[PDB]
Design an enzyme around this catalytic site. Structure first.
Site, PDB file in Angstrom:
ATOM      1  CE  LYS A   1      -3.873  -2.460   2.054  1.00 36.19           C
ATOM      2  NZ  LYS A   1      -4.928  -2.426   3.105  1.00 36.19           N
TER       3      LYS A   1
ATOM      4  CB  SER B   1      -4.797  -2.057   7.491  1.00 37.85           C
ATOM      5  OG  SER B   1      -3.517  -1.749   8.043  1.00 37.85           O
TER       6      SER B   1
ATOM      7  CB  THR C   1       2.352  -4.003  10.030  1.00 38.49           C
ATOM      8  OG1 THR C   1       1.003  -3.569  10.246  1.00 38.49           O
ATOM      9  CG2 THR C   1       3.259  -3.306  11.034  1.00 38.49           C
ATOM     10  N   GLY C   2       2.039  -5.770   7.619  1.00 35.76           N
ATOM     11  CA  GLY C   2       1.182  -6.609   6.801  1.00 35.76           C
ATOM     12  C   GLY C   2       1.233  -8.040   7.309  1.00 35.76           C
TER      13      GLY C   2
HETATM   14  C1  LN1 Z   1      -2.270  -5.582   6.142  1.00 37.65           C
HETATM   15  O1  LN1 Z   1      -2.276  -4.475   6.689  1.00 37.65           O
HETATM   16  C2  LN1 Z   1      -2.834  -6.887   6.703  1.00 37.65           C
HETATM   17  C3  LN1 Z   1      -2.910  -8.005   5.977  1.00 37.65           C
HETATM   18  C4  LN1 Z   1      -3.616  -8.912   6.653  1.00 37.65           C
HETATM   19  C5  LN1 Z   1      -3.980 -10.224   6.355  1.00 37.65           C
HETATM   20  C6  LN1 Z   1      -4.752 -10.938   7.271  1.00 37.65           C
HETATM   21  C7  LN1 Z   1      -5.152 -10.332   8.459  1.00 37.65           C
HETATM   22  C8  LN1 Z   1      -4.793  -9.021   8.761  1.00 37.65           C
HETATM   23  N1  LN1 Z   1      -4.004  -8.301   7.851  1.00 37.65           N
HETATM   24  C9  LN1 Z   1      -3.496  -6.999   7.925  1.00 37.65           C
HETATM   25  N2  LN1 Z   1      -3.593  -5.964   8.762  1.00 37.65           N
HETATM   26  C10 LN1 Z   1      -3.138  -6.114  10.150  1.00 37.65           C
HETATM   27  C11 LN1 Z   1      -1.623  -6.329  10.196  1.00 37.65           C
HETATM   28  O2  LN1 Z   1      -0.916  -5.665   9.413  1.00 37.65           O
HETATM   29  O3  LN1 Z   1      -1.194  -7.147  11.038  1.00 37.65           O
HETATM   30  C12 LN1 Z   1      -3.561  -4.892  10.969  1.00 37.65           C
HETATM   31  C13 LN1 Z   1      -2.773  -3.639  10.572  1.00 37.65           C
HETATM   32  C14 LN1 Z   1      -3.361  -5.211  12.441  1.00 37.65           C
HETATM   33  O4  LN1 Z   1      -1.967  -5.446  12.682  1.00 37.65           O
HETATM   34  C15 LN1 Z   1      -1.770  -5.566  14.020  1.00 37.65           C
HETATM   35  O5  LN1 Z   1      -2.420  -6.382  14.672  1.00 37.65           O
HETATM   36  C16 LN1 Z   1      -0.717  -4.680  14.686  1.00 37.65           C
HETATM   37  C17 LN1 Z   1      -0.503  -5.199  16.106  1.00 37.65           C
HETATM   38  C18 LN1 Z   1       0.628  -5.947  16.411  1.00 37.65           C
HETATM   39  C19 LN1 Z   1       0.791  -6.464  17.691  1.00 37.65           C
HETATM   40  C20 LN1 Z   1      -0.175  -6.232  18.664  1.00 37.65           C
HETATM   41  O6  LN1 Z   1       0.033  -6.702  19.924  1.00 37.65           O
HETATM   42  C21 LN1 Z   1      -1.307  -5.481  18.355  1.00 37.65           C
HETATM   43  O7  LN1 Z   1      -2.260  -5.218  19.290  1.00 37.65           O
HETATM   44  C22 LN1 Z   1      -1.470  -4.963  17.075  1.00 37.65           C
HETATM   45  S1  LN1 Z   1      -5.338  -4.574  10.673  1.00 37.65           S
HETATM   46  O8  LN1 Z   1      -5.991  -5.905  10.903  1.00 37.65           O
HETATM   47  O9  LN1 Z   1      -5.821  -3.645  11.654  1.00 37.65           O
END
Ligand code: LN1
Ligand code: MA4
Length: 265
Positions: free
Chosen positions: A48, A105, A210-211
């Site tokens: 992105k 995201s 992040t992803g």
């Molecule tokens: C891309 O942004 C992405 C791709 C995928 C695929 C499956 C599920 C979720 N995806 C996301 N978004 C997701 C991540 O990038 O991991 C978001 C941005 C959430 O993240 C986090 O969970 C960040 C995080 C890390 C560690 C923790 O302890 C916490 O509370 C949060 S999105 O789902 O919001």
């Protein structure tokens, strides 16, 4: 924490997965740490940032406006659209869509923007135009996160991604305002950013995207540095590990801790 490379090796051992990493000076492009830097990894949501760089390039050329309002339909939405699902009646501006895609995201916001640049083929052509001959986008959200073993679709390499991020943020290919906007969107991450800041020692700057994906895929593209400065680009990707999301997050954080404790290199 151990030396960066030693920590990276430890993460592959503990995760039974492949880690790809590059640590690079943002201002000059000097490569500091490189591990599996030329191997392919699924980009997942990190694509992105490149997407919005292509959008900003169109704005700079006068072919797009961040103010332009795009109206879409419920049938256009895909899985996870926290911001875009709220604007079925009033639409969202192109700039708002980039903020939603990068800071929240939002997957539908990303697909709406992808269409404006010519879809996956169009974004790949943009990458080729700025000199990235490796990164490729082939699918839309959310299929681009599938991460099938050995699948070259929707992948980059740590070295290619770091170089491309550097080109977009500092090479003057994008206008000054556009470079500043892309950076601000990364600084404004509303998900991972705040949590990372909460655990970073005082004085460390962080901006990121992040992803995550299937089969353990996980990654982050970030700007990091002491003295509250964006000194380095750090790209870390993980793939093919059966580990829990918590453990993948912990290993990435551990590589970051190794960098922080052994910064002067
Ligand atoms: C891309 O942004 C992405 C791709 C995928 C695929 C499956 C599920 C979720 N995806 C996301 N978004 C997701 C991540 O990038 O991991 C978001 C941005 C959430 O993240 C986090 O969970 C960040 C995080 C890390 C560690 C923790 O302890 C916490 O509370 C949060 S999105 O789902 O919001
Ligand atoms: O000696 C250096 C520092 O060592 C510790 O800091 C820890 C911190 O308490 C911990 O929370 C963090 O975890 C790492 C958190 C990083 C999270 C994301 C990393 C991402 C983003 C940036 C690029 C790489 C990946 O590590 C550092 C370094 O050991 C001390 O707590 C701190 O007072 C001291 O200044």
């Amino acid at each position: 924490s151990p030396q960066p490379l030693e920590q990276i090796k430890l993460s592959e051992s503990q995760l039974s997965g492949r880690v790809g990493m590059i640590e690079m000076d943002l201002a000059s492009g000097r490569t500091l740490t490189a591990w599996r830097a030329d191997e392919r990894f699924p980009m997942m949501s990190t694509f992105k940032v490149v997407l919005c760089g292509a959008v900003l390039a169109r704005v700079d050329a006068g072919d797009e406006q961040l103010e332009r309002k795009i109206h879409y339909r419920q049938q256009d939405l895909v899985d996870y659209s926290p911001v875009s699902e709220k604007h079925l009646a009033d639409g969202m501006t192109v700039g708002e869509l980039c903020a939603a895609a990068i800071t929240m995201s939002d997957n539908s916001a990303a697909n709406l923007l992808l269409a404006t640049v010519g879809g996956p083929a169009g974004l790949t052509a943009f990458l080729r135009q700025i000199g990235d001959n490796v990164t490729r986008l082939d699918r839309w959200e959310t299929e681009l996160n599938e991460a099938l073993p050995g699948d070259a679709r929707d992948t980059t390499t740590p070295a290619s991604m770091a170089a491309t991020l550097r080109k977009l943020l500092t090479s003057q290919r994008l206008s000054a305002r556009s470079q500043r906007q892309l950076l601000q969107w990364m600084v404004d991450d509303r998900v991972a950013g705040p949590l990372i800041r909460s655990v970073l020692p005082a004085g460390w700057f962080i901006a990121d995207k992040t992803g995550a994906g299937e089969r353990g895929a996980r990654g982050i593209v970030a700007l990091l540095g002491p003295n509250n400065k964006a000194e380095r680009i750090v790209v870390i990707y993980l793939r093919d590990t059966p580990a829990s999301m918590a453990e993948r997050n912990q290993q990435i954080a551990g590589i970051g801790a190794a960098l922080i404790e052994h910064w002067q290199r």
